[PDB]
Amino acid sequence: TYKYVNLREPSMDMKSVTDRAAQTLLWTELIRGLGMTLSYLFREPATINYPFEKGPLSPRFRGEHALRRYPSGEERCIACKLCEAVCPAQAITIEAEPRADGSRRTTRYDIDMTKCIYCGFCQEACPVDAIVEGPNFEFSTETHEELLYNKEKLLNNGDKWEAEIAANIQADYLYR
């Protein structure tokens, strides 16, 4: 099924021809366009007062990464390296060894935030909810080196943002 967007014959009777002549000489369609921009002048603008107001986001928002803990404070990450395997950008680098208590834990967990594409595949792959993309998006830096996160940086993000991260996961985990 189709329709023609521009297949019409103008009426060539004198009244129609004078209507087109009046439009040409008196600029009527142009005046109508001015009415439209005038109507917008008196409309309330759509601008929000950043940073005092913020754009709406949802619990699924993919922002700055962070490493999480169990309620006891033990790390959730068990160095399975599934995040590192799935990462489309190869932005994750991991090393691990048996910890002094025999636990399976990482000794390196780096995310190159300038390789990362913020796709969220790592938090989908993680079997224990250790690596997440948090809700923060206001972490621009003055140097490139500040965006090469190591494990310390990522654990601090987890301790910094856990209150919000736990609430967001609560809101969306039944969709996962």
Binding site: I48, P51, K151, E162, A163
Partner: protein
Amino acid sequence: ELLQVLKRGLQQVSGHGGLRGYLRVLFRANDVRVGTLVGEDKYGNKYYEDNKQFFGRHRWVIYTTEMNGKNTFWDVDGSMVPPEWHRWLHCMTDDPPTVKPPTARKFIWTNHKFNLSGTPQQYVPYSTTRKKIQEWVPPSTPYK
């Protein structure tokens, strides 16, 4: 209604507690709207709502003038919002932390920090792993 519009404008001066308070919010936030005080966080940020305003302008924060030893009268920053209010301010939820407080954990930062880039507190990357190859150390006693 031209009179009623001007009355509301005058009510905003009173709503901000006089001309000085009115001019302070005008020069700090470029906005003199009066809203309902939803709450205040431990850093002095105050949170307001007005559900007659369109989505996006119905919630806002007035940043504290002093945070973690930094003068923030003029230098406000979006990272100054602590996580528990961050969810409410960005409309990830409808419940402010006053009504639905976050779950408490012993390892959660008690004191929020804003973006520290470009300061002496900035993050500096480094390798977190130990040396892998151990060199032989020659004996300290001669016997060539």
